[PDB]
Ligand binder design. Sequence first.
Ligand SMILES: CC(=O)N[C@H]1[C@H]([C@H](O)[C@H](O)CO)O[C@@](O[C@H]2[C@@H](O)[C@@H](CO)O[C@@H](O[C@H]3[C@H](O)[C@@H](O)[C@@H](O)O[C@@H]3CO)[C@@H]2O)(C(=O)O)C[C@@H]1O
Ligand SMILES: CC(=O)N[C@H]1[C@H]([C@H](O)[C@H](O)CO)O[C@@](O[C@H]2[C@@H](O)[C@@H](CO)O[C@@H](O[C@H]3[C@H](O)[C@@H](O)[C@@H](O)O[C@@H]3CO)[C@@H]2O)(C(=O)O)C[C@@H]1O
Ligand SMILES: CC(=O)N[C@H]1[C@H]([C@H](O)[C@H](O)CO)O[C@@](O[C@@H]2[C@@H](O)[C@H](O)O[C@H](CO)[C@@H]2O)(C(=O)O)C[C@@H]1O
Ligand SMILES: CC(=O)N[C@H]1[C@H]([C@H](O)[C@H](O)CO)O[C@@](O)(C(=O)O)C[C@@H]1O
Lengths: 124, 118, 118, 118, 118
Amino acid sequence: AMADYDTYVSNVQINNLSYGVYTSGGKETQFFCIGLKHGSEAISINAMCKVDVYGNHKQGFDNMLNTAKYYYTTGGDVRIYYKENVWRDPDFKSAFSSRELIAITTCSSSSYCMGPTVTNLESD
Amino acid sequence: AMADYDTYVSNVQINNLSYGVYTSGGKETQFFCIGLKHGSEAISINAMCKVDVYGNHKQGFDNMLNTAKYYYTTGGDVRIYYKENVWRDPDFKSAFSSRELIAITTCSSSSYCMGPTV
Amino acid sequence: AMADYDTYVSNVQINNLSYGVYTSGGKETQFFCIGLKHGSEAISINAMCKVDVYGNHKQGFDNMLNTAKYYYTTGGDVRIYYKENVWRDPDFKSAFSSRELIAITTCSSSSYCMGPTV
Amino acid sequence: AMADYDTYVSNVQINNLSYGVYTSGGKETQFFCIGLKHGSEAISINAMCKVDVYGNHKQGFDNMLNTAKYYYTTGGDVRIYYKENVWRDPDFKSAFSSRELIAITTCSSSSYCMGPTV
Amino acid sequence: AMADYDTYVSNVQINNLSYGVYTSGGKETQFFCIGLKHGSEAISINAMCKVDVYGNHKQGFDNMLNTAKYYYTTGGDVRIYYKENVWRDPDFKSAFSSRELIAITTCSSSSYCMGPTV
Ligand SMILES: CC(=O)N[C@H]1[C@H]([C@H](O)[C@H](O)CO)O[C@@](O[C@H]2[C@@H](O)[C@@H](CO)O[C@@H](O[C@H]3[C@H](O)[C@@H](O)[C@@H](O)O[C@@H]3CO)[C@@H]2O)(C(=O)O)C[C@@H]1O
Ligand SMILES: CC(=O)N[C@H]1[C@H]([C@H](O)[C@H](O)CO)O[C@@](O[C@H]2[C@@H](O)[C@@H](CO)O[C@@H](O[C@H]3[C@H](O)[C@@H](O)[C@@H](O)O[C@@H]3CO)[C@@H]2O)(C(=O)O)C[C@@H]1O
Ligand SMILES: CC(=O)N[C@H]1[C@H]([C@H](O)[C@H](O)CO)O[C@@](O[C@@H]2[C@@H](O)[C@H](O)O[C@H](CO)[C@@H]2O)(C(=O)O)C[C@@H]1O
Ligand SMILES: CC(=O)N[C@H]1[C@H]([C@H](O)[C@H](O)CO)O[C@@](O)(C(=O)O)C[C@@H]1O
């Protein structure tokens, strides 16, 4: 399976966005975070962030930001791939999220979203 | 004829888009992939991808991504030029396809899209 | 708490924008500034600026400019994090402001904006 | 007069766009082409291209692409400045055009578009 | 006062735009120029331009171009800050003007625009 593509949430909408600058560990960083809803329902996995100079994948900051802004604007249905337990600074985690944003794919219907899905119920 | 312009599908619409970051073959990549429809017709050749650090043509990642995103927004008719059998990462190929996106042109009628047809 | 996130205003709207190039303190700079709406007044309050080559955070100039331009376009409610007493060029501070923009987050309701609170 | 500004078509609309990646003369290129209409009047001078690493002016690839995409979206009236007989790749010239795109200006009426005239 | 901010026109709209590539004084340049109106009337102070590799402030070419494009789209009321007597290529100044674009700020009423006044 595609490494780092095993945890996602499907058929959500990006309903909040944050962008900011922040000093961490002696490095000047940019970050953004997305907030999610599932139609009129609140979900448990509802926020995720990307940081330009930290994380498992530092590439693609601007392309990911522009993609997140696009879907916040359209309100379209998406699948968000994310990684747990990446941001470990507790004050950033409290303020924003611990999860790193990995990918954003579209859902053209209530039953199809683009991108890899887990093999089976146990992700063997 | 133009090398790598011999394989295309015309008058399709980009109806899905994926963008992500991913480690492939020991390298940090960005990729995007487009999903296609042709109205209500059943199509099998329906997904094409571009990767920033792999492929026959590594240039133009941002410009191709922004172009693909534009036509996803409009839903307009386009021609997709692509190359078969490029992606060798088995997990990536299974999730998307082996096809590399080469070019996107517009179609202004049922009978015309820009670019070569030979 | 997150350093530089202690001072903010919530559920505000950006009603004016400035972008320019300017020589300050012997350096060539770009800057932009946002003005915030107060009631029905035309004149903005609480202006905040970012400068490409000066400030506590020089990174993110283009992304912050594009974010500010976005919310000026939509008129949506946002929370703005900023730092007081940053710009020391007296002509610039008099013309625009002495505050430096740190972050912009959305407010999805009258009681919730993303980001940390005090 | 401004060199390379002597040949233009006025009050046209950009009604087609192409963007692709391509190996030409042994070098990796990006290119884009614009296709034109003139309302309902038949126009033969109807396609112009720009290439990132070839041409009389290599600068401004992304800005010219983004400008062309802008006018394709709006359908607004523009003047196109171009140079004939530029592209030496015969496969490219037959697929797209020989003409190099030099400038795009707007037209605010049927008689006025910005820029120099002959 | 802020150097280079003393000369401006207020409550204008950007009603034309030019973008092109051009060889000037032996250098390969990009430029753009803005055309203005003053509501229902013409204004004879016009055609302010920015050049990527010449001028008093060469930074911010892309951000100024994108900002100009934005106000051309919205038609919003703006103040333009500019510097007189900059461009010395006689063919360029005859086709456009000699004025270097310095800043664009918004106007929220018929009597207020952001930025300093004389
Ligand atoms: C996203 C992705 O699929 N990336 C994989 C890439 C791309 O498929 C490829 O670069 C596109 O052109 O392929 C990777 O594996 C290649 C690499 O191991 C080279 C090294 O020799 O071999 C390539 O296959 C060769 C083969 O070895 C030759 O003998 C002959 O058969 O031709 C083929 C041409 O493909 C591998 O594809 C890569 O690292 O480049 C792995 C990426 O994950
Ligand atoms: C370089 C320079 O002189 N800039 C001044 C400009 C120019 O003189 C003017 O734009 C050239 O046409 O004028 C500035 O003041 C004008 C501005 O406040 C506009 C706002 O709409 O009003 C102009 O007054 C109008 C007036 O309100 C009308 O009733 C009528 O009387 O005509 C005049 C002309 O339009 C003000 O002159 C400017 O900011 O544009 C001041 C600049 O310093
Ligand atoms: C677009 C344009 O007009 N470019 C001019 C350029 C600009 O006018 C100038 O750099 C902006 O400050 O001026 C050029 O020519 C001259 C210089 O060679 C010389 O150093 O000084 C001259 C004035 O006394 C004049 O500016 C230039 O910088 O090369 C010519 C160029 O086409
Ligand atoms: C736009 C502006 O005000 N720039 C001024 C900066 C900023 O105030 C600080 O860089 C903020 O951290 O301060 C200076 O003293 C400096 O650093 O040399 C002078 C300069 O003119």
